């Protein structure tokens, strides 16, 4: 009864110091305070924990909550607690074990007196505020602290060496602050219990200190977004419980530790965007691996066959390296591959036939390699695909029938190969198709009418093929179509006359075909058309005056059968090359019409 009274009064006093526009604390306005929202009590009915996470509360830190004599846990995670932290705010909070002030609006410095006022803390988070000035050196006096998270503030100076004295720490998160360029303090190697070290975006320079080899309980080492130099040290390989290594966007050089293969516990490894050389380690037994990213390095040699031992692998991004050889033939048969990006390497041989064996593959990105042979019919049934980029390889044969109509396929990029065949009518199934990029192949036959039913299409790019027959009238009501490029084909017939459907058409390129008829007047009323190339066809009649409405980066009507006069806006000799090779055409200058 006495404790319920005490508790209720202190909680209400604290609440009076806050604004509650969401009415999150309506229960604090008949019932025991032990059953109020966010409030937990011990068996003597004293408040032990207040958790107001995500309650949309506004105002200064509610110091009054610390007057609850048994309060051990306080969370104000994700509110609008504002102003600054004063020394005084925490004077009475000395019983706290847990304090979470993350994701608020706090500004100013961390009080230097905080460890003295909060000497029992095991858990301190003040991530995602606007804290400035340095991390106080007094933080080295915490005797019990297990986790410290100051990530995502504007803290500056350098990481204090005294944090190495807090040998109870298991997690140290200081990522995304505004520190001066400095080395990781050697003294952090004294934190021999550390499981998480997150110093991403900390302006770190120099090598990973050798003392960090004493952190044998590391589970997550994340030093991303710094300018760390030298080798990735081979001691990471001997961490018996390591699950995640994140070292991307640094200046690491040398090779991947040769014994990486034995890291059976490793789930995620990313050393992308460094200056690594040499090979991917072989004899991989990476049983728990989910993600391997090594893109934008200078790696050479093959993808080892032993990658196929990673039966939970879902992400493999190796793009922009100097990797060579054939891919392991079994890649993806036994892995839930989701994102595969091996672009800009020198891989050869066939695309592994079961890359989508488990039906999870979303991105297949293989641009700029020397892959050859045909696309497996398997991929024709890979219904999870959203993004396919196979351009600039040595691929051939017919595309699998179902590939054209995959239901989630957004980008279909096949350009600069030697594919043959006609586009089937089953392209009608590609409901999500945004970009069709198939230029520079040997595709034949007519562009199917059904492409006009795919309302989301923004790009149809099919230049340098063997397409023939007519442009389907249906293309003309693709309301979102931005780029139409069917240059260098064998297309015939006319351009449709009614083009107001093409409100987003920026580029119309039909150069080098067998197209005939007049240029429709409505070409000039297209509101965002900046590129118009109708050259090397058999267009006849007069150049519509509406073209003078457009601001064209490219206008090319050369090598046609056009007649009459050039529109006056283009009468100057600098435009002449836009109209060459139209015997019937002339320019009106000074009275006479000149060829």
């Amino acid at each position: 009864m006495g404790s319920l009274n005490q508790d209720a009064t202190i909680l209400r006093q604290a609440k009076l110091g806050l604004s509650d526009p969401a009415q999150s604390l309506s229960s604090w306005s008949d019932v025991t305070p032990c059953k109020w929202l966010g409030v937990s009590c011990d068996a003597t009915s004293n408040v032990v924990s207040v958790d107001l996470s995500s309650f949309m509360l506004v105002g200064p830190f509610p110091s009054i909550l610390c007057h609850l004599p048994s309060l051990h846990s306080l969370s104000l995670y994700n509110n609008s607690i504002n102003g600054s932290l004063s020394a005084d705010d925490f004077d009475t909070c000395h019983n706290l074990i847990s304090l979470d002030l993350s994701e608020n609006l706090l500004v100013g410095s961390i009080p230097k007196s905080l460890p003295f006022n909060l000497p029992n803390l095991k858990f301190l988070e003040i991530s995602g505020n606007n804290l400035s000035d340095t991390i106080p050196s007094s933080f080295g006096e915490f005797r019990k602290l297990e986790s410290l998270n100051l990530a995502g503030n504007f803290l500056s100076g350098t990481i204090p060496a005294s944090l190495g004295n807090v040998t109870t720490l298991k997690e140290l998160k200081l990522a995304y602050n505004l520190f001066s360029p400095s080395q990781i303090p050697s003294q952090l190697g004294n934190l021999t219990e550390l499981q998480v070290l997150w110093l991403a975006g900390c302006n770190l320079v120099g090598p990973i200190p050798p003392s960090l080899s004493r952190l044998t309980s590391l589970v997550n080492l994340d030093l991303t977004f710094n300018q760390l130099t030298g080798s990735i040290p081979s001691w990471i390989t001997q961490l018996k419980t390591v699950e995640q290594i994140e070292l991307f966007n640094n200046s690491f050089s040398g090779e991947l530790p040769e014994s990486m293969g034995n890291m059976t516990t490793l789930k995620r490894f990313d050393a992308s965007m460094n200056k690594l050389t040499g090979k991917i380690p072989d004899n991989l037994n990476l049983l728990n691996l989910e993600s391997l990213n090594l893109f934008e390095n200078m790696l050479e040699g093959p993808l080892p066959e032993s990658i196929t031992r990673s039966k939970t692998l879902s992400e493999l991004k190796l793009f922009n390296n100097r990797l060579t050889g054939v891919l392991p033939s079994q890649l993806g048969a036994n892995s839930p591959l989701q994102y595969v990006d091996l672009s800009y390497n020198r891989f050869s041989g066939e695309i592994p036939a079961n890359v989508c064996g488990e039906g999870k593959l979303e991105y297949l990105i293989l641009i700029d390699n020397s892959f050859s042979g045909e696309i497996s019919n398997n991929l024709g049934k890979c219904k999870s695909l959203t993004r396919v980029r196979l351009s600039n390889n040595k691929l051939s044969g017919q595309i699998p029938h179902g590939f054209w109509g995959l239901p989630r396929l957004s980008l279909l990029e096949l350009s600069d190969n030697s594919f043959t065949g006609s586009i089937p009518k089953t392209i009608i199934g590609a409901k999500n198709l945004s970009n069709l990029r198939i230029s520079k192949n040997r595709f034949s036959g007519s562009i199917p009418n059904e492409i006009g039913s795919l309302n989301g299409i923004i790009e149809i790019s099919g230049a340098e093929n063997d397409f023939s027959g007519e442009i389907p009238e249906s293309l003309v009501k693709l309301k979102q179509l931005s780029r139409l490029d069917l240059s260098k084909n064998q297309l015939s017939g006319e351009i449709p006359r009614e083009l107001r459907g093409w409100k987003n058409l920026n580029e119309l390129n039909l150069a080098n075909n067998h197209l005939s008829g007049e240029i429709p007047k409505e070409v000039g009323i297209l509101p965002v058309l900046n590129y118009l190339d109708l050259s090397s066809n058999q267009f006849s009649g007069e150049i519509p005056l509406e073209l003078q409405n457009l601001k064209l980066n490219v206008l090319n009507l050369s090598y046609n059968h056009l007649s009459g006069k050039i529109p006056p806006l283009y009468a100057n000799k600098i435009y002449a090359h836009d109209f060459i090779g139209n015997p019937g055409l002339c320019v009106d200058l000074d009275g006479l019409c000149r060829k």
Binding site: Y176, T224, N249, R268, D270, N293, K317, S343, I367
Partner: peptide, 12 residues
């Protein structure tokens, strides 16, 4: 908020 401790999402 803050970028998570996780893999780079960059891709072609």
């Amino acid at each position: 908020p803050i970028p998570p401790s996780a893999p780079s999402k960059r891709h072609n």
